[PDB]
């Protein structure tokens, strides 16, 4: 690099720089998806909005490929690059909560767990994903859903404004009253339009929630899934009920006989009065014979911390995901036969139901696509051994292929590293080309292209 520019950048940067020669480089460059092994020229750990301005201008002037990293959970591996700069936000994880306002301001590098901790100090909360180690940054920019979404919508449905650094180094506010074209785009358009350094959210009061997790044999697979899809079609918003097909974990609540064998793990909660929730959950817990039933009344922060129970975190991941408008009987049996071939104990075939509040938002209100498709399926292969990559990748691909016509769209936040060309299909032509128009205005050179990328014009 040009020393003057490198020196210039350094003069303006108060964070920590990690070079390939430094000691925390190999670990700083690893992301959650360990199949992605890349070596940046530079890792810039920003500590403030001025730091990110300096890093973005440096990358622009040097012509370095820009990776932005929040929590490192990209299933496509977008948060690390070969030979470019990582704009790493993981040290910007402060959150200010006003109890009086029911508002949270969170930095771009926050983890969900920290966010939930800070808001639950006041018994407040807003929708986010179910794994607490996930970064707020990439989750919100792609939409973000979890236990609270059927009641309160997507994370973007509770976003009130952002502070964002654009590719030319300027700091902008985006809200419904300031740069509203940009505010439209960041609500579902990913990292395409700049580095969000602050997210502001509306918060809701969420007290203890009745929660249940249990396991069904695949022998009862057809009636469980059918009961689930039938019930969710008319369920109240307060009910969330998700199915995860997987090998049974060797946990004491399940008989040793079931351990390591394909099962349906069913998790459900009631967002509302726990007494009503006890009644609602028990009415849906017995479509199959429930094994290893755990029922609890949990602080919301404890529900957020629950997924998923297990001795390790898988090192290698490959996901194939899409939406469904209906889950047909043919589609049910296909999921069940593919679940029966699960090989790794970390792999999950996820069946999620959204709808509710998410569905109620007008389709063009944000850049998030496919609100009106209630089902999400995610074949989430996960494993350890690098020499078994092909078998696990193959399980997720062929499951996806067997379902293909039932599936439409795609959640940008579940895309794998080979799915760069799924961007148009995911958004649809209308949203895609409106996003292209916002990109030509705020990122005309496509400085931000490590994402489900939207080329300008």
Ligand X SMILES: Cc1cc2nc3c(=O)[nH]c(=O)nc-3n(C[C@H](O)[C@H](O)[C@H](O)COP(=O)(O)OP(=O)(O)OC[C@H]3O[C@@H](n4cnc5c(N)ncnc54)[C@H](O)[C@@H]3O)c2cc1C
Q: Looking at residues 57 to 76 of the shown chain, list those that interact with ligand X (rule: CB under 6 A).
A: 68-75
Site string for its own copies, 22-41 (x = CB under 8 A): --x--x--------------
Binding site feature residues for FAD: 68, 70-74, 79, 108, 130, 135, 138-139, 145, 196, 411, 413, 450
The C-alpha atoms of residue 438 and residue 445 are separated, in whole angstroms, by 12
Residue of 41, 114, 394, 402 that binds its own copies (CB under 8 A) = 114
CA distance 293 to 285: 9
- Of 89 and 403, the one with the shorter C-beta distance to its own copies is 89
Question: Does 188 engage in binding with ligand X (CB under 6 A)?
Answer: no
> Is residue 392 packed enough to be buried (19+ CB in 10 Å), middle (13-18) or exposed (0-12)?
buried
Q: Is 189 near ligand X (CB under 6 A)?
A: no
Q: Which of residues 134-163 bind its own copies (CB under 8 A)?
A: none
CB of 73 to ligand X, least distance (A): 3
| Chain CA centroid to CA 9, Å | 32
> What, of its own copies, ligand X, none, does residue 118 touch, CB below 5 to 8 Å by kind?
its own copies
Question: Residues in contact with its own copies, total (CB under 8 A)?
Answer: 57
Euclidean distance between CA atoms 86 and 28, whole angstroms: 10
Strand 85-88 versus strand 66-69 pairing type: parallel
CB 84 within 8 A of CB 64: yes
Bridge partners, residue 205, by sequence: 124
DSSP label at residue 47: -
Chosen residue from 15, 40, 84, 108 binding ligand X by CB under 6 A: 108
Q: Which residues are annotated as a binding site?
A: 68, 70-74, 79, 108, 130, 135, 138-139, 145, 196, 411, 413, 450
State which residue, 219 or 282, has the beta carbon closest to its own copies. 282
425 binds, among its own copies, ligand X, none (CB under 5 to 8 A by kind): none
195 is an interface residue for ligand X by CB under 6 A: yes
Pair 104, 126: CB distance under 8 Å: yes
Strands (E), 53-94: 66-69, 85-88
d(CA 303, CA 289): 24
Enumerate long-range contacts of 55-59, CB under 8 Å, 24 or more apart.
Answer: 55/9, 55/13, 55/85, 55/87, 56/87, 56/165, 56/166, 56/167, 56/169, 56/194, 56/195, 56/447, 57/9, 57/12, 57/169, 58/5, 58/6, 58/8, 58/9, 58/85, 59/84, 59/85, 59/87, 59/447
Q: Between 291 and 316, name the residue whose CB sits nearer to ligand X.
A: 316
Which listed range, 95-103, 135-143, 223-231, 326-334, lies at the site for ligand X (CB under 6 A)?
A: 135-143
By CB under 6 A, name the binding residues for ligand X: 31-32, 68-75, 78-79, 89, 108, 129-131, 134-135, 137-139, 141-142, 144-146, 190-191, 195-196, 413, 450-451
By CB under 8 A, name the binding residues for its own copies: 14, 24, 27, 47-48, 90-96, 98-100, 111-114, 116-118, 120-123, 132-133, 207-208, 210, 251-253, 274-275, 277-278, 294-302, 304-313
């Amino acid at each position: 690099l040009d020393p003057a520019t490198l020196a210039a950048f350094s003069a303006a940067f108060r964070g920590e720089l990690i070079w390939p020669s430094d000691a925390d480089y190999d670990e700083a460059r690893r992301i959650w998806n360990g199949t992605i092994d890349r070596r940046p020229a530079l890792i810039a750990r920003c500590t403030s909005t001025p730091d990110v301005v300096a890093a973005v201008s440096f990358a622009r002037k040097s012509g370095l490929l820009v990776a932005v990293r929040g929590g490192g959970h990209s299933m496509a591996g977008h948060s690390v690059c070969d030979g470019g700069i990582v704009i790493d936000l993981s040290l910007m994880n402060s959150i200010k909560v006003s109890r009086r306002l029911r508002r949270a301001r969170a930095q771009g590098g926050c983890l969900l767990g920290a966010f939930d901790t800070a808001t639950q100090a006041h018994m407040l909360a807003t929708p986010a994903g179910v794994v607490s180690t996930t970064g707020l940054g990439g989750l919100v920019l792609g939409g973000g859903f979890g236990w609270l979404s059927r009641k309160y919508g997507l994370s973007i449905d509770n976003l009130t404004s952002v502070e964002i650094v654009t590719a030319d180094g300027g700091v902008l506010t985006a809200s419904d009253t300031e740069n509203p074209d940009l505010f439209w785009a960041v609500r579902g358009g990913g990292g395409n339009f700049g580095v969000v350094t602050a997210f502001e959210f509306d918060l809701h009061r969420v007290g203890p929630v009745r929660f249940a997790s249990t396991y069904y044999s695949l022998d009862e697979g057809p009636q469980v899934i059918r009961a689930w899809r039938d019930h969710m079609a008319t369920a109240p918003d307060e009910l969330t009920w998700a199915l995860y097909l997987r090998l049974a974990p060797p946990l004491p609540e399940l008989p040793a006989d079931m351990h390591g064998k394909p099962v349906i793990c069913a998790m459900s909660c009631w967002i509302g009065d726990p007494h009503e929730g006890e009644r609602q959950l028990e009415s849906i817990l017995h479509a199959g014979k429930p094994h290893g039933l755990t029922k609890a009344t949990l602080p919301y922060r404890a529900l957020q911390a629950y997924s998923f129970p297990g001795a390790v975190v898988p090192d290698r991941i490959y996901t194939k995901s899409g939406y469904l408008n209906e889950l047909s009987d043919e589609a049910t049996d296909t999921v069940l036969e593919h679940a029966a071939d699960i090989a790794s104990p970390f792999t999950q075939l996820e069946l999620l139901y959204l709808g509710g509040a998410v569905a109620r938002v007008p389709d063009d209100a944000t850049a998030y696509p496919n609100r009106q498709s209630p089902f999400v399926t995610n074949l989430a292969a996960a494993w350890m051994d690098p020499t078994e990559d092909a078998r696990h990748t193959a399980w997720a691909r062929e499951g996806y292929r067997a379902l293909a016509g039932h599936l439409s769209g795609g959640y940008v936040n579940f895309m794998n590293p080979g799915e760069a060309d799924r961007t148009r299909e995911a958004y649809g032509a209308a949203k895609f080309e409106r996003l292209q128009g916002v990109k030509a205005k705020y990122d005309p050179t496509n400085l931000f292209r490590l994402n489900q990328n939207i080329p300008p014009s």
